[PDB]
């Protein structure tokens, strides 16, 4: 019954693995973020 | 069940990517038992050791190839939904058969014999069945409730 | 002013009015408009649902002032002035990452379109966030203990304090760290701010 | 009304605001009693101040089409002619819209009562649910994507460019632009891309 | 009532059209007021 | 009554324009039925079928150019009916001393008189207050929403 929580995690594991690679890719390719705070112009 | 089906292999390829946190494959030892339990095979801790698998953390881990002879031994033996010594294993304090036993001796005999599990579950075998003030609580419905199951079939 | 309002606005703002003009009469980038503020002007430049939904910059997806309020230019030396303060840490290689998007400070017309239609890398903010939020156990989780050993025997090599400092910023909740806050440092709300 | 007839009473009905040149004739026949004129034109009357903003710049964006001359007071139909075809975006039929947002020649002095006459205009305020709503069999608010639908399947036929443009130029609120906002469009929610 | 398409569908569809013929124009006005929440602007 | 006059031609164009939806000026065969009824010729279902109409799904499309040399025949022998007659009639049933009408009861009296109400129309008379407590109409808003038609066009 709990394996249900884990069964929707089978596709989710495939998303965090590409995203961890993009944690370093977009840190060599910055100017791809900027969202509301006090720094925008 | 009493034999491997083709869909239980097709189910197990999908659920392989769950067990390894990467989305790859490698069955964790406690999640060894969760795969057999989501494929209608629910051995004891002494039947697990006969098949050569696992159902708890710290025990052998395997890959899905290696999971097929382990899974196939349970099919040849009990616990795939077969009846013998479930609601046939209860009652011995009553020499009457009314399909009932005593309330007091239906919650501290699973705790004084058995593999021994939670006091909450000892309270579910008392809850599923009827209550009267004659001291007669049925044993035989909590088991059929398990036959009904979350899924009678292959979990998902 | 007048019909020659358009004809003076190319002499008022000229970082993109001498790079693209009118298509129905010489005017600044749009087919005829004299002024069209800090708008993305003519056609699209971004249709949202690719990395941002609530932020626009004058080179992210839009243009500077073609108005009589002179140039509005936002430099790439302003992006370098974000990593110096609040935003992603001060690192010298990120100021080199700015040369890697196009050298030095640079004029924009078809640069604002490239990045505005760039979906490369991490995707949409609700798409990236949602993954383990289709089930919930601590607000969605990824089991923290099983993922670290799969990120030091294989996969990316992060130590056992680097899987706490570069894959986590959420406490174990649901027999795993919260996946929401883990996605956050990768993209939006912890990946921010990469300027301007 | 037969086949032939409903071609004729686009051009012949034409009950204000519908007395406009069209895309291939203006609006499809309203039935014989003139109740429905009120959904052809709505008009309010609140005047809003000029030079109070700094998105006031917009009047300079429109200017050229409505002021050939450098101090305006040009010809009185030229608002009703040119502005139709690329001012507040492409495709003519803006006749009665223009004659009801300008009460004679528009210029910077005159701007208070055009900015004000936006809110009078055509299909401005007098917000009512039922108008578009009764299409989808009275079930949910009737928004953008079902209008596009209807234009390629049923109803009288008109230029397809305007519709595909209009969807793309949507702000997005998520259920699109409801009937409320289709009227109440002056107060929030407008367009993108080329023009004015 | 129970044709299911010739009912109150028609009155709405004609007003729907009266907007559709000029949907590019009529979704704005002389002064573009949207600067709040637009896909590129 | 009335002969062929501008006013009738308008009445017929108006009902027709409601009855399309395609924007092509084509109405189906069956719609000849209720067009003629709205025009106040007071046909029977026989008169409809005489004009190749239907009480089933359409078979073919009619332009107004077909419909009108049928119609200029239909006008002969007709009563345009009064309004005040149906009010006076329906005042006869009361249920509060205010001209209020239980829905079933109003279907039933029509059923059992005349050419006799069909299964479907008694469901339609009933429809308003269906399946709750049954279910009170009032004569004045009843007749009035029927004759007016439910949105012939409105300015709201």
What does this structure look like?
The structure is cut from a larger assembly and holds two copies of chain A (41 residues), two copies of chain B (156 residues) and two copies of chain C (196 residues). By secondary structure, chain A is mainly α. Helix content of chain A is 39%, strand content 0%. Chain A contains three helices and no strands. In chain B, helix 4 (45-51) crosses helix 5. Chain B has eight helices and two strands, in the order H-H-H-H-H-E-H-H-E-H. Chain B is elongated. Chain C is an all-alpha fold. Chain C contains six helices and two strands; from the N terminus they run ααααβαβα. In chain C, strands 1-2 form a two-stranded antiparallel sheet. Chains D and E meet through helix 3, helix 6, helix 7 and helix 8 of D and helix 1 and helix 2 of E.
What class do helices, strands and sheet pairing of chain C give? Answer: mainly alpha
Order of helices and strands of chain A: HHH
The rough form of chain C would be described as elongated
User: What structural class do the secondary elements of chain A suggest?
Assistant: mainly alpha
Oligomer: part of a larger assembly
PDB class: motor protein
Keywords: myosin, thick filament, insect flight muscle, motor protein
Entry title: The interacting head motif in insect flight muscle myosin thick filaments
Chains A, E: Myosin 2 heavy chain striated muscle
Show the helix and strand layout.
The structure is cut from a larger assembly and holds two copies of chain A (41 residues), two copies of chain B (156 residues) and two copies of chain C (196 residues).
Chain A: H1 3-7, H2 13-19, H3 22-25
Chain B: H1 6-14, H2 16-19, H3 30-37, H4 45-51, H5 68-76, E1 100-101, H6 119-122, H7 124-128, E2 137-138, H8 141-148
Antiparallel strand pairs in B: 1-2
Helix pairs in contact in B: 4-5
Chain C: H1 6-9, H2 80-83, H3 112-116, H4 125-129, E1 141-142, H5 144-148, E2 177-178, H6 179-186
Antiparallel strand pairs in C: 1-2
PDB class: motor protein
Keywords: myosin, thick filament, insect flight muscle, motor protein
Entry title: The interacting head motif in insect flight muscle myosin thick filaments
Entry keywords:
part of a larger assembly, 6 chains, A: 41 residues, mainly alpha, 3 helices, elongated, C: 196 residues, two-stranded antiparallel ribbon, 6 helices, 2 strands, motor protein, myosin, thick filament
């Amino acid at each position: 019954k709990e394996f249900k929580k884990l069964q929707e995690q089978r596709v989710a594991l495939l998303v965090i693995q590409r995203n961890l690679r993009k944690f370093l890719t977009l840190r060599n390719w910055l100017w791809y973020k900027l969202y509301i705070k006090v720094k925008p112009l | 069940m009493a034999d491997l089906k083709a869909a239980e292999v097709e189910k197990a390829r999908e659920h392989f990517e769950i067990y390894d946190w990467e989305g790859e494959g490698k069955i964790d030892a406690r999640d060894l038992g969760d795969l057999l339990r989501s494929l209608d095979c629910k051995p004891t801790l002494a039947m697990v050791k006969k098949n050569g698998g696992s159902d708890k953390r710290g025990e052998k881990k395997l890959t899905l190839e290696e999971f097929l002879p382990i899974f196939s031994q349970i099919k040849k033996e009990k616990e795939v939904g077969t009846l013998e010594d479930f609601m046939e294993g209860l009652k011995v304090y009553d020499k009457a058969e009314n399909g009932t036993m005593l309330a007091a001796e239906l919650a501290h005999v699973l705790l004084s014999l058995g593999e021994r599990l939670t006091d909450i579950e000892c309270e579910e075998i008392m809850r599923v069945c009827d209550e009267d003030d004659d001291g007669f609580l049925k044993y035989e419905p909590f088991v059929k409730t398990i036959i009904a199951g979350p899924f009678p079939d292959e979990g998902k | 002013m007048g019909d020659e309002e358009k004809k003076e606005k190319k002499k008022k703002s000229k970082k993109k009015s001498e790079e693209e003009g009118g298509d129905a009469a010489p005017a600044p980038p749009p087919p005829k408009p004299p002024s069209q503020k800090r708008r993305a002007q003519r056609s699209g430049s971004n249709v949202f649902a690719m990395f941002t939904q609530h932020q626009v910059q004058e080179f992210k997806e839009a243009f500077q002032l073609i108005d009589q309020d002179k140039d509005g230019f936002i430099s790439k030396n302003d992006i370098r002035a974000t990593f110096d303060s609040l935003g992603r840490l001060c690192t010298e290689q990120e100021l080199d990452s700015m040369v890697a998007e196009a050298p030095g400070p640079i004029n924009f017309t078809m640069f604002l379109t490239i990045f505005g239609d760039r979906i490369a890398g991490t995707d949409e903010e609700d798409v990236i966030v949602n993954a383990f939020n289709l089930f919930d156990e601590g607000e969605g989780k990824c089991k923290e203990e099983t993922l670290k050993r799969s990120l030091t025997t294989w996969g990316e090599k992060f130590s056992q304090d680097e899987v706490e400092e570069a894959l986590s910023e959420a406490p174990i909740d649901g027999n795993g760290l919260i996946d929401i806050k883990k996605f956050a440092q990768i993209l939006t709300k912890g990946a921010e701010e990469e300027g301007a």
